[PDB]
Design a protein around this ligand. Structure first.
Ligand code: HEM
Ligand code: A6B
Ligand code: K
Length: 407
């Protein structure tokens, strides 16, 4: 038993492609590369894999977008593979469908959407600068550990009005959930995280301030007050949603720049291209793959899907699709129409996308200004990991500090 689930009778054999989203066979060549094997010409647009309990995978942008739009057939009630993890998952609004999702989404948007971002730009700037300056004269760092991890969690603490001293504890709680070693069930990891949040929400419903947790926990949904349980489930997501996505995305980006002096030089000589370069990086190193559960039997693009079937709808694949972007594996900061679904698509389109772009942009601007020349540490083989949010296990970087400048 290679732990492949028995093929359900409604699934025709010609659609079977046993891709393992947690351990894809081509991983050492890069995680995007490993997933992009689903886009080779003999692979159908929609396939069934017997790995991880058995589930569909939409392999092309067209189908990915369509399924993300159609929440009536493709429900977020069970958004993760394997089924047991999807079933346990209760974060808001990511575990809900419209119409109920819409009210909770509007509340979340108050704490992370556009006007909040335009406002936070300078605390973001300060944080990046102080982290980079602490590393600069060392001539080395573990980028994932020393910059990518501390950065988003500190921004979240700021949004949420949580004290600095809580960072290590909260880092520990979130790592438990998002990088499981198998010592804990997903529901157990969630519970530990909730145990931290339960008291703070209680406190802030009694005595609200103007932080994100206070806005959320005292908000109105469908014309009534939000429950303490709902507030907890939203805060959980606002905490985690901006963590591993940003940590891992920044690591993919920095790994690419470390290996590409010419792309570094382009952005050094033309810093105005940094916003467009962020978008082209978001496409090439897209990293999320969640999904949906069928609400009923449904024929979708010629394939019979059954009520209860899970479907993986990898956000990462759309922008890598040759049918969406010519020469997809190639990074071109002057690509003219960069299409991707890196932030998702449809009713759940990332609410933190504006904050995420500021984090990436500030990072690239501030890093390249201080440390224009860096490389992968000699002889290091960069290891990737695949999953719901794919990523980089560690990123040792080296530079000559004489080539750097303190601003
Ligand atoms: C590179 C960074 C990021 C990526 C790639 C990303 C990706 C995504 C994706 C793909 C979804 C949709 C999931 C689905 O349809 O099931 C999503 C939703 C969400 N994201 Fe992000 N995200 C990022 C950063 C952030 C940040 C910094 C925050 C701030 C807390 C955040 C907050 C949220 C929230 C609240 C939702 C749920 C929206 C809803 O369900 O209506 N994200 N994100
Ligand atoms: O629950 C999981 C998956 C289980 C991984 C273990 C598998 S099972 C068999 C196999 N063998 C092994 O040794 N291991 C594997 N952890 C993954 C992390 C769960 C993260 C939950 C929190 N994140 C979120 O809610 C999200 C929601 C949404 C927006 C953001 C990006 C993405 C979409 C995830 C944040
Ligand atoms: K669920």
């Amino acid at each position: 038993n290679a732990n492949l689930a028995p093929l359900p009778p409604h699934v025709p054999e010609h659609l079977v492609f046993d891709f393992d989203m947690y351990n894809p066979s081509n991983l050492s060549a890069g995680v995007q590369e490993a997933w992009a094997v689903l886009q080779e010409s003999n692979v159908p647009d929609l396939v069934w894999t017997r790995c991880n309990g058995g589930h569909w995978i939409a392999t092309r942008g067209q189908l990915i977008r369509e399924a993300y739009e159609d929440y009536r057939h493709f429900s977020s009630e069970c958004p993760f593979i394997p089924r047991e993890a999807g079933e346990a998952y209760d974060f808001i609004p990511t575990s809900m469908d419209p119409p109920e999702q819409r009210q909770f989404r509007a509340l979340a948007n108050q704490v992370v959407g556009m006007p909040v971002v335009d406002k936070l730009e300078n605390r973001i700037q300060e944080l990046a600068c102080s982290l980079i300056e602490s590393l600069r004269p060392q001539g080395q760092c573990n980028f994932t550990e020393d910059y990518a991890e501390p950065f988003p969690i500190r921004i979240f603490m700021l949004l949420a009005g949580l004290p600095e001293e809580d960072i290590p504890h909260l880092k520990y709680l979130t790592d438990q959930m998002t990088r499981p070693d198998g010592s804990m069930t997903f529901a157990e990891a969630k519970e530990a995280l909730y145990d931290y949040l339960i008291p703070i929400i209680e406190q802030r419903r009694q005595k609200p301030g103007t932080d994100a947790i206070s806005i959320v926990a005292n908000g109105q949904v469908n014309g009534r007050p939000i429950t303490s349980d709902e507030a907890k489930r939203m805060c959980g997501l606002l905490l985690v949603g901006g963590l591993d996505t940003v940590v891992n995305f920044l690591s993919f980006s920095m790994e690419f720049l470390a290996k590409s002096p010419e792309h570094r030089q382009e952005l050094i000589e033309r810093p105005e291209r940094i916003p467009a370069a962020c978008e082209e990086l978001l496409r090439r190193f897209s990293l999320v793959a969640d999904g949906r559960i069928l609400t009923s039997d449904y024929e979708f693009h010629g394939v019979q899907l059954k009520k209860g079937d899970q479907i993986l709808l990898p956000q990462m694949l759309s922008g890598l699709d040759e049918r969406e972007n010519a020469a997809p594996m190639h990074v071109d900061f002057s690509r003219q129409k960069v299409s991707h679904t890196t932030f998702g698509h449809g009713s759940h389109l990332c609410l933190g996308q504006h904050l995420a772009r500021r984090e990436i942009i500030v990072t690239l601007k501030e890093w390249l200004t201080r440390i224009p020349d860096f490389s992968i540490a000699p002889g290091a083989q960069i290891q990737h990991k695949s999953g719901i949010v794919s990523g980089v296990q560690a990123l040792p970087l080296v530079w000559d500090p004489a080539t750097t400048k303190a601003v």
